[PDB]
Design a protein around this ligand. Structure first.
Ligand SMILES: Nc1nc2c(ncn2[C@@H]2O[C@H](COP(=O)(O)OP(=O)(O)O)[C@@H](OP(=O)(O)OP(=O)(O)O)[C@H]2O)c(=O)[nH]1
Ligand SMILES: [Zn+2]
Ligand SMILES: [Zn+2]
Lengths: 99, 90, 118, 50, 1160, 119, 49
């Protein structure tokens, strides 16, 4: 199997297919252990945001790839923003303040 | 540094900073003002930066200083516009 | 057929939190793909399309670039008709359509928009 | 999108109010069709090939 | 003059209660109808759970009705329907609220272990706090006569008390009653009066609840949250997209359970509102309130009490809490079945053509449009979708120096994911270098690996400078090489030695490389003779460089040709003069330590190529005649069965103890098994005769099987013993051993009986393996969770103290020395020398300088060394105190990630640990790390004194020992059970043994010392690895034990509140800033406390990191009570947020941001 | 006494957290999905001190609690029903009469009637 | 498990100390469980379903 960019689930903007392409590979805890062990901060950074479930990040970084710019320009993944809304959905309030 | 890359770390301790500065230089090359120092020989910008670091040129202080000169070149040489704008709102 | 449409309203119906493959652990709502989003490839082609068109209207004249641009309404939101452009360019209707057709004649050799078609 | 309207205007519209969802053999595999089959609804115009 | 009001960068997140107005701030409208979607038009209703005006529009930029369509009105709302036409993702972020009539209690702050609403109010949970809000027993809200302040009354008591007084002590019942109860409560005045009362003339008979509640009340009052928010009156609504009802295939919608919950609570709330306007019967209204309570409690968190059903499904409904209480798929990835690739290098891997084509899609697109060929992006798409030859060449350009990292399923350690340079291969399978095939613990049974493409620039450099296979020469666990040649190659190089006498031999001498010409041209053999040649050796000393040394040594053909592979340096010849077995890795290791990276890598490739080539040239096979059985087999078996026959005959006529003849006859068959084993080995080993010059001589058998066994290559003594010898004692399901071992062997026939006996061993073997394989990772998770927060920082601090390292000697009564536990270790301070000088202060013991610790004779077997256990560091680890043990030869880079690598290395060999006064195995390791007290804990003398009996069994009691001397006595408790070890009158020292049994780590740490307890743990956890034969450095154990002793207990009087057990982090940093702040008397002295991995991991600063592993419902709640905030230095909690990791390539970013957050 | 001594003495520490044990050594109506969480929360986690926070805290159903207050019968007969209904009609009558006393209610009805006839 | 009735072991440590504690159990084909087990105090208890 191989996947560059395909479909994503409605609930969580995570890669999946079987209709035209193939659902992307799963990283996991066992792998993030290794990346932390190496110290590959940027590898894990992308693997957790733009390379996975970052709505605008994937598109922005994709355009950066086709233009031969690479870089990243990451952002807060929806797999945490949803968590913010879910916790906020209860009587408990969580806010991300500046400094 | 096609296979270590280990000979570059002793030039700047802690492999991490090595990755930072090398990615910095490679970022300068891939997009914007290219101009490599060590001959390309059909190598990606990933390794070219590592070659330079191994060569002895292009470090952290080097890039920072050249960035300072770059700023003093873009700013001081083109102040005739900024100064003219300074009189815009008195 | 009315009965057919009736059975299409029955049931709650099914909830996403229903187990299916019984993996570790499966969920019906996890197989539901999103369709409102566009492919990054498609978005890239759209951006490249904007740049392509923005670069094609450069090889045209002002009284022809603006014509094609304003008629089909691009980079200006509200698109106008033959009359609203014929009044702002003196000669009305047919004349502005003539140039509008001539511009289309210009694009029969370049391959950019040609391959962008598909 | 305006650019697409212009693009089709230069190569011919034919902007049919229909899309596309034809069954295509998945990329990678390849073989020979050995048997076709069609299960029609009870009250639908049967096809020629059917 | 900043004060920006946009979504910029954040340094921390805050968690706390939400006021009703706080809920209103998120409200973009109010849900008022249980309606969802239209039955016919399929269009969102007015004020339903899926409103368009409140939440967001269906389509992107067009409103509900259709008055406005395109981007013309993106900021203006519609006239006919107030629908803000922006995006459709707006519908995913819009909140909303429902404003209930009568107040409602939050299920979390109500019933979540401690009664948060109860403990704050000091009132029973499921007893009193239930009966007064479920409309049953009215409660009081403060009275100035007869009645107290928080007593419970019945309707009869209510009217009676109302009749006696009334109109001056009014107190309602239900939710709003508890609301006024919390609201009327003054946290401040009680915080004062409680401090006054709970300190006046009270010993240890009260202090518990006193300190507990006062700390809790102080925390809550300082938190900022008002107790009014405890029970909600306004319930917020989750965005529609996070709980949509999307039409599946041909009708049949798919909705979330939350819609059912919200619909129910809306219905019940509306009826409640309607009842409070029409006729109001007390029973009906109170019941509907309880029903509203049911709906709300079910929506927030089901749990918990019966579980609301409905929805046709017999399964419960997934509430909000159930969606956040308990695998990150990623793009640009793939996987396939692996295959060996001998022709590959060490930094290369076989990546399929079509596979790599789909992977680097965006790269191929960009490069195509960059060069030319494709006029546009879509042109490139249509060009690669139709694989048009030239595109492939472009592919060869994009994957040039663009590393791709490979990964296997069971990722135990860091070497689970290694990067390689992609090499196009005409096929659909992925090829891998056979050298790094051991790091993955991968075989070619059909296993499949996954590939990931580093997209980011610095991600490519991370994969090249860190995750590259060439950078992982040495194992992170032990300094020994990991890419060491295995079965096939080692057999090859083993065959390239093996000095055989004569047979086309003779001492025809030449000069190295020239000998190669001799080999291909036949004439001479290959394993002769020995023969002499000229070897040009190279050595260096002092001033480095290179010094030639030509000589004439007596090697063989194989050694001569193999010598060409050896790099510039090395002692030469002597590394080849040996053979191929274990020194095969030793040679690679020494080459690494004396040469460097690159020459060590190419040497590995060369020895791999040479190994495979000559292995193929050899043609070693495995026929049926390769496993020769001993002739003395039947003889030995008869002799053994003869002895056991006599024993049985004796048992028949009594004499010997028949009760245990089973054991002694087992010794008989076991002895016989060793006899057959010894006979087979002595036979299959030597043998041969040859015919040297005048004939008659003996070497060692060239019997293939023996060649494989005497050269690694998967072949042990036991297996061979079962092949030709015999399978010994077989296990029985009872756990006992059968007194009739498998006399036959695999070379021979096997009877149905003994096979039906062996099937038990195979069954339990696979079963136990399946258990310990999952149990190993089960331990690894705990190890990581407790250790994945410490990173080597602040360069190199001071300090000299550290555990005195000494060779682990069981040689007291068994003889077993190991003196390699000191290497790459930073010395404490000049550890003496039988004379003077020698060792420096902070000089790290080099690999060549540890060999200098043999020139100081066997006298010096004790050196003080700085360890991670000690170290006066604060929130990290000193670089010196750690060591250097990595794939790198130098010291650990500043800002690494010691924790995860340590945990991985420890839980890696867990797969090969056999679970069971000696437990032994994985379970033993777990018990050691958890710091659990033994089933029969020993006792020690706390203070050195005079041992004397303290009243022979006068309690209670049970013996009592009282070691009293100097000043003050002590009364320990001996429970008769188990004897003693010290008579009366005798004196003892500070921490003497007085039970002679299993020692408890708690007592050791508390009394003996930290160095002692850590030494105990490390030297006890290794002893279970010695038996299993798994090499693992002591550094990692010291690493986990470091934070295993994270917290302590202060006992005196200081700024800290005495009884509180806090970590030595804040303790040390505060005691250092108090001796020179105002006065040293404003602080107390602490005491280290031993706590297990789980107990240690339980405590952590970040509430998000805690919300990860442990019970989320608890941590999130308690963190909600007190205005806590993560800020924000942890690894785990900074991963789920999706940002740079405060370690490795990061760290510097975090350091800059950390110093940046000092302005305010 | 019973619950406290049994729970503490037995659970030391039950090794594998033998849940299916003391749950039967508890009174009241069993087989509930409520008391379950109050035991799995005490055994581990905050060991030692948690076993002291358990007793101090230990020192249910909608419909069943609805039938409880519904238990108050106060049933009626034909005489009772007619009686209560009579009081209702009496109350309504007094209210309507009290409205009749109000002259502005009459004049308003007159004004609104003229509004009705004026369409 | 075959229907009928069998006496189970439960041998070994079940409450520290370690002392037998035998128990009988009746397994119906279509009905409710009927168990009989002892305790450390040598009392007899019954489990219905
Ligand atoms: N250690 C090292 N090698 C470099 C370096 N730069 C280039 N090389 C070597 O170049 C060889 C092949 O590179 P090519 O792509 O064919 O040519 P190129 O140098 O112009 O790019 C490899 O040899 P090889 O590694 O010896 O092959 P092998 O030992 O893996 O079998 C590679 O290691 C470097 O900076 N350090
Ligand atoms: Zn509208
Ligand atoms: Zn240190």
């Amino acid at each position: 199997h191989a996947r560059s960019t395909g479909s994503y689930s409605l609930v969580t903007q995570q890669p999946l297919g079987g209709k035209a392409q193939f659902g992307g590979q799963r990283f996991g805890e066992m792998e993030v252990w290794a990346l932390e062990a190496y110290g590959a901060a940027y590898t894990l950074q992308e693997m957790l945001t733009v390379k996975s479930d970052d709505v605008n990040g994937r598109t922005k970084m994709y355009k950066n790839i086709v233009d031969g710019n690479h870089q990243m320009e990451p952002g807060m993944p929806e797999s945490f923003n949803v968590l913010l809304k879910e916790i906020r959905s209860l009587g408990i309030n969580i806010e991300l303040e500046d400094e | 540094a096609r296979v270590t890359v280990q000979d570059a770390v002793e030039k700047i301790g802690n492999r991490f900073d090595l990755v930072l500065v090398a990615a910095r230089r490679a970022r300068q090359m891939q997009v914007g003002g290219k101009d490599p120092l060590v001959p390309e020989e059909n190598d990606k910008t990933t390794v070219i930066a590592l070659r330079e670091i191994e060569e002895g040129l292009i470090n952290n202080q080097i890039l920072d200083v050249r960035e300072r000169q770059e700023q003093q070149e873009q700013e001081a040489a083109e102040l005739q516009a900024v100064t003219a704008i300074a009189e815009g709102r008195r | 057929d009315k009965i057919r449409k009736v059975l299409k309203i029955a049931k709650e119906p099914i909830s996403m939190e229903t187990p299916i493959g019984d993996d570790e652990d499966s969920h019906l709502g996890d197989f539901i793909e999103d369709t409102t989003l566009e492919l990054p490839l498609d978005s890239a082609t759209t951006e490249s399309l904007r740049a392509a068109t923005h670069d094609v209207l450069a090889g045209l004249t002002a009284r022809e670039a603006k014509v094609l641009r304003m008629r089909f309404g691009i980079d200006m939101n509200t698109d106008y008709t033959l009359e609203e452009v014929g009044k702002q360019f003196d000669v009305t209707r047919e004349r502005i359509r003539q140039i509008e057709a001539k511009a289309l004649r210009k694009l029969r050799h370049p391959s950019r928009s040609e391959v962008l078609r598909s | 999108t305006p650019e697409e309207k212009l693009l089709r205007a230069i190569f011919g519209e034919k902007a049919s109010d229909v899309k596309d969802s034809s069954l295509r053999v998945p990329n990678g595999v390849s073989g020979t069709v050995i048997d076709v089959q069609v299960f029609t609804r009870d009250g639908v115009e049967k096809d020629k090939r059917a | 003059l900043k004060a920006q009001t946009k979504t910029e960068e954040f340094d921390a997140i805050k968690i706390a209660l939400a006021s009703p107005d706080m809920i209103r701030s998120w409200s973009f409208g109010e849900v008022k109808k249980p309606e969802t979607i239209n039955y016919r038009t399929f269009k969102p209703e007015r004020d339903g759970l899926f409103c368009a005006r409140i939440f967001g529009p269906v389509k992107d930029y067009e409103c509900l009705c259709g008055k406005y369509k395109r981007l013309k009105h993106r900021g203006v709302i519609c006239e006919k329907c107030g629908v803000e036409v922006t995006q459709t993702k707006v519908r995913r972020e819009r909140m909303g609220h429902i404003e209930l009539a009568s107040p409602t209690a939050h299920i979390w702050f109500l019933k979540s272990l401690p009664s948060r609403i109860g403990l704050l109010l000091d009132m029973p949970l499921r007893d009193i706090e239930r009966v007064l809000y479920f409309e049953s027993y009215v409660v009081i809200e403060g009275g100035m006569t007869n009645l107290e302040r928080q007593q419970i009354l019945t309707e009869e008591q209510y009217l009676d008390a109302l009749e006696e007084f009334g109109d001056e002590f009014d107190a309602k019942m239900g939710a709003e009653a508890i609301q006024a109860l919390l609201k009327s409560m003054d946290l401040e005045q009680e915080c004062e009066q409680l401090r006054e009362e709970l300190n006046e003339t009270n010993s240890e008979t009260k202090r518990k609840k006193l300190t507990k509640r006062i700390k809790l009340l102080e925390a809550f009052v300082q938190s900022g949250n008002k107790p009014e928010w405890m029970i909600l009156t306004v319930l917020p609504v989750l965005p529609p997209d996070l709980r949509p009802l999307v039409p599946l295939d041909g009708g049949r919608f798919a909705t979330s359970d939350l819609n059912d919950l919200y619909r129910r609570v809306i219905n019940r709330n509306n009826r409640l509102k309607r009842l409070l306007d029409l006729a109001a019967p007390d029973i009906i209204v109170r019941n509907e309130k309880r029903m509203l309570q049911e709906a709300v409690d079910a929506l927030l968190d089901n749990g918990r009490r019966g579980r609301a059903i409905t929805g046709s499904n017999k399964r419960p409904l997934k509430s909000l809490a159930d969606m956040i209480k308990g695998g990150k798929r990623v793009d640009y990835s793939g996987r396939s079945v692996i295959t060996v690739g001998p022709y590959l290098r060490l930094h290369q891997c076989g990546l399929p053509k079509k596979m790599a084509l789909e992977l680097f899609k965006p790269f191929i697109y960009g490069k195509l449009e960059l060069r030319g060929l494709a006029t546009t992006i879509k042109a490139a798409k249509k060009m690669v979708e139709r694989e048009e030859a030239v595109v492939w060449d472009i592919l060869d350009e994009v994957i040039r120096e663009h590393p791709v990292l490979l990964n296997r399923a069971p990722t135990l350690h860091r070497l689970g994911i290694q990067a390689f340079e992609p090499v196009l291969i005409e096929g659909k399978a992925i090829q891998l270098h056979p050298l790094v095939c051991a790091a993955y613990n991968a075989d070619f049974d059909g296993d499949q690996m996954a590939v990931h493409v580093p997209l980011t620039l610095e991600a490519q450099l991370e994969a090249r400078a860190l995750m590259m296979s060439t950078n992982n020469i040495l194992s992170p666990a032990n300094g020994e090489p990991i890419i060491v040649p295995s079965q096939d190659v080692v057999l090859g190089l083993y065959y390239m030695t093996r000095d055989c006498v004569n047979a086309k031999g003779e001492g025809m001498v030449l000069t190295g490389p020239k000998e190669a010409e001799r080999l291909y041209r036949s004439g001479l053999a290959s394993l002769h003779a020995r023969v002499k040649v000229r070897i040009t050796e190279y050595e260096k000393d002092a001033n480095g460089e290179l010094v030639a040394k030509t000589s004439l040594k007596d090697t063989t053909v194989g050694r001569a040709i193999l010598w060409m592979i050896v790099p510039k340096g090395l002692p030469y010849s002597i590394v080849n003069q040996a053979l191929g077995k274990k020194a095969i890795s030793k040679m690679l290791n020494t080459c690494y330590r004396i040469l460097g990276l690159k020459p060590t890598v190419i040497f590995a490739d060369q020895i791999m190529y040479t190994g495979f080539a000559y292995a193929a040239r050899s043609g070693a096979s495995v026929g049926i005649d390769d496993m020769v059985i001993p002739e003395k087999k039947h003889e030995i078996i008869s002799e053994a069965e003869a002895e056991v026959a006599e024993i049985q005959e004796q048992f028949q006529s009594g004499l010997v103890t028949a009760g245990e003849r089973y054991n002694k006859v087992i010794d008989i068959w076991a002895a016989a098994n060793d006899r057959v084993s010894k006979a087979m080995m002595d036979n299959l080993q030597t043998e041969t005769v040859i015919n040297r010059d005048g004939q008659e001589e003996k070497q060692v058998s060239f019997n293939s099987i023996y060649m494989m066994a005497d050269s690694g290559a998967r072949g042990s003594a036991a297996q061979i013993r079962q092949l030709a010898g015999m399978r010994g004692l077989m296990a029985k399901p009872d756990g006992s051993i059968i007194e009739t071992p498998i006399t036959a062997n695999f070379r021979e026939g096997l009877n149905v009986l003994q096979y039906f006996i062996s099937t038990h061993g195979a069954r339990k073997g696979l079963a136990d393996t399946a258990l310990k394989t999952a149990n190993s990772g089960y331990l690894t998770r705990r190890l990581v969770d407790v250790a994945q927060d410490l990173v080597v920082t602040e360069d190199d601090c001071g300090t000299h103290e550290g555990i005195m390292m000494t060779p682990v000697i069981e040689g007291g009564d068994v003889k077993e020395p190991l003196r390699d536990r000191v290497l790459g270790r930073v010395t404490a301070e000049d550890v003496l020398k039988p004379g003077t000088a020698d060792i420096l202060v902070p000089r790290n013991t080099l690999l060549h300088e540890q060999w200098c610790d043999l020139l100081e004779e066997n006298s010096v077997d004790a050196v003080k060394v700085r360890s991670v256990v000690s170290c006066d560091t604060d929130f990290g680890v000193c670089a010196h105190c750690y060591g250097r043990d990595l794939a790198r030869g130098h010291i650990i880079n500043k800002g690494e990630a010691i924790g995860v690598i340590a945990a991985q290395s420890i839980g890696e060999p867990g797969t090969q640990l056999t679970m069971r006064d000696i437990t032994g195995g994985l379970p033993r390791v777990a018990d050691l790390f958890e710091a659990r007290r033994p089933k029969e804990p020993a006792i020690l003398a706390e203070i050195s004194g005079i041992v004397s009996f303290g009243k022979e069994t006068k309690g209670k009691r049970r013996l009592v020992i009282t070691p009293v001397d100097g000043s003050d006595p002590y009364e320990e408790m001996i429970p008769k059970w188990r004897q003693l070890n010290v008579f009366e009158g005798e004196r003892v020292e500070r921490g003497d043994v007085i039970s002679d049994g299993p020692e408890a780590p708690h007592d050791i740490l508390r009394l003996r010392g930290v160095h002692a307890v850590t030494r105990y743990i490390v030297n006890e956890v290794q002893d279970v690895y010695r038996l299993q034969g798994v090499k693992i450095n002591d550094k990692h154990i010291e690493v986990i034990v470091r934070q295993m002793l994270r917290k302590a207990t202060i006992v005196n009087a200081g700024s800290s509140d005495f009884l509180e057990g806090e970590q030595v982090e804040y303790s040390r940093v505060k005691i250092a800033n108090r001796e020179l702040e105002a006065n040293g008397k404003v602080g107390a002295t602490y005491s280290r406390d031993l706590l297990g991995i789980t107990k240690a991991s339980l405590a952590t600063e970040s509430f998000i990191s805690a919300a990860s592993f442990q019970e989320t419902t608890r941590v999130l709640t308690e963190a909600a009570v007190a205005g806590k905030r993560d800020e924000l230095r942890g690894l785990k909690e900074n991963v789920i947020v999706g940002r740079l990791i405060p370690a490795g390539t990061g760290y510097a970013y975090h350091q800059d941001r950390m110093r940046r957050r000092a302005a305010g | 006494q019973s619950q406290l001594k049994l729970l503490v003495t037995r659970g030391k520490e039950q090794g594998y957290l033998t849940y299916a044990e003391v749950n039967d050594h508890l009174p009241e109506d069993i087989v509930d999905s409520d008391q379950i969480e109050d035991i799995i929360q005490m055994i581990n986690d905050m060991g030692i001190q948690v076993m002291e926070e358990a007793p101090d805290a230990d020192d249910t159903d909608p419909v069943r609690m609805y039938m409880r207050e519904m238990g108050t019968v106060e049933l009626l007969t034909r005489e009772g029903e007619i009686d209560i209904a009579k009081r209702i009609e009496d109350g309504i009558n007094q209210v309507q009469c009290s409205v009749a006393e109000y002259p502005e209610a009459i004049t308003y009805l007159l004004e609104q009637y003229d509004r009705v006839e004026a369409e | 498990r075959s229907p009928g009735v069998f006496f189970d072991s439960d041998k070994g440590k079940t409450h520290s100390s370690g002392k037998v504690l035998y128990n009988a159990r009746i397994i119906p084909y279509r009905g409710s469980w009927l168990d009989f087990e002892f305790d450390p105090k040598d009392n007899l208890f019954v489990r219905i379903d």
